[PDB]
Amino acid sequence: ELSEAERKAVQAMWARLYANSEDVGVAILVRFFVNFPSAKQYFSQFKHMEDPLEMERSPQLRKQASRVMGALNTVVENLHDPDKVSSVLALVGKAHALKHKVEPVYFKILSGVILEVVAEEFASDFPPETQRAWAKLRGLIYSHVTAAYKEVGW
Amino acid sequence: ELSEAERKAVQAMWARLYANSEDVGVAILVRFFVNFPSAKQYFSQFKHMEDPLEMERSPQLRKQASRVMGALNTVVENLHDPDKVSSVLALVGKAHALKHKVEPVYFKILSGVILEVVAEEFASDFPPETQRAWAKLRGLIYSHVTAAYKEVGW
Ligand code: HEM
Ligand code: HEM
Ligand SMILES: [C-]#N
Ligand SMILES: [C-]#N
């Protein structure tokens, strides 16, 4: 869990990010699929795409970006309610294990990608205090998602 | 395995990286450790470094960077001799499996990082025919390292 200052520093960041949630989610997923093509495999929509400029344009990927961003949104907006953050990531985890059958490690890879993009987008307003704050939310998603994978028996 | 055209493409690309192997290896390791803090954990000598400027400047992180580029150069310089590269990568696999006790997925994460660092530094000499070529070398490396981990029973 986080403080009130770390929570506020993360939400202020996410405030800007989510202003153009579509164009940010897309930069994230395109980099995820370019730098880790093994991640595409899980996606019947994208598994046959190699051109990154083709991914930027594709409507289904934009539909997928929104979907991730929006779920992340519910987490960031509820960091004050640890019963809410728990319950949301429980659901994301379980569904990714049971329906999507995704190897839990990719959540770690995706996280790092989210850091790289955020670090480029917001270089001039990403001080040490905010980096650590963001590292704390990363660890939070990861250990809640992995407990769901454990709970379901992976 | 790569064709004669794909081999030369990788080599012409690698000749540019390796012209300043220290600087490039350092750039790679630093991003690796920042976006994947859990990779740091493995290194007794770096697990407590947090400031990226502090890393660039440390002689020991420089030395480790020259060790990676050093080994990679031997793979790349020998891409005509597949028994040769098969041997080097298996040696690298078994060492990291048995002596360093590094989990094998970290090799995929590092390559991903190598691709993003190369894209940033050498955009001008990284056209789609080379992107495509480099991606095959990556798949070679990984499956020869996966095989090394399996041969040893991980
Ligand atoms: C921050 C972490 C993540 C969040 C919040 C997230 C969110 C979502 C949401 C909300 C959906 C749609 C609802 C559903 O069917 O479950 C979805 C679908 C999906 N997710 Fe994720 N996701 C995350 C990470 C990942 C990762 C790392 C992968 C593996 C590459 C992945 C693979 C998939 C797949 C294959 C689908 C189905 C897409 C389809 O309908 O074809 N997710 N995700
Ligand atoms: C194919 C890419 C890689 C190459 C060419 C490479 C090369 C090397 C070399 C030459 C050494 C020193 C000699 C030795 O003991 O083998 C070394 C040490 C080491 N490597 Fe790697 N490595 C690679 C990937 C990785 C990855 C992905 C990790 C994950 C964290 C890793 C972790 C380590 C550790 C913990 C050591 C020992 C550190 C020490 O000297 O105290 N390596 N590597
Ligand atoms: C991922 N969606
Ligand atoms: C790895 N050094």
Numbering used by the authors:
A (entry chain A), B (entry chain B): 18 to 171
Sentences from the paper on this structure:
Almost independently, the sequence of this globin was identified in mouse, man and zebrafish and, given that it is expressed in all types of human tissues, was eventually termed cytoglobin (Cygb). Human Cygb consists of 190 amino acids, showing extensions of about 20 amino acids at both C- and N-termini with respect to standard globins.
Since the HE7Q mutation disrupts the endogenous bis-histidyl hexacoordination with HisE7, the comparison of wt Cygb* and its HE7Q mutant provides clues on the transition from exogenous hexacoordination to the endogenous one through the pentacoordinated species. The two subunits (A, B) found in the X-ray structure are assembled in a dimer identical to that found for native Cygb*. Superimposition of the Cα atoms in the protein core of the two subunits reveals a strong structural conservation (rmsd of 0.45 Å), with limited differences in the G-H loop (residues 137–146). The absence of ligand coordination likely arises from X-ray-induced Fe(III)→Fe(II) reduction, resulting essentially in loss of heme affinity for the ligand, as has been noticed for other heme proteins. The largest deviations are found at residues 60–66 and 70–83 (CD-D stretch and beginning of helix E), as the shift from endogenous bis-histidyl hexacoordination to pentacoordination drives the E-helix 1.5 Å away from the distal site pocket (measured on the Cα atom of the E7 residue), increasing the distal site volume by about 73 Å3. However, the Gln side chain is pointing to the exterior of the distal site, while the His side chain is oriented to the interior, thus suggesting that the pentacoordinated native Cygb* highlights an intermediate position of HisE7 in the mechanism controlling exogenous ligand binding through competition with the endogenous ligand.
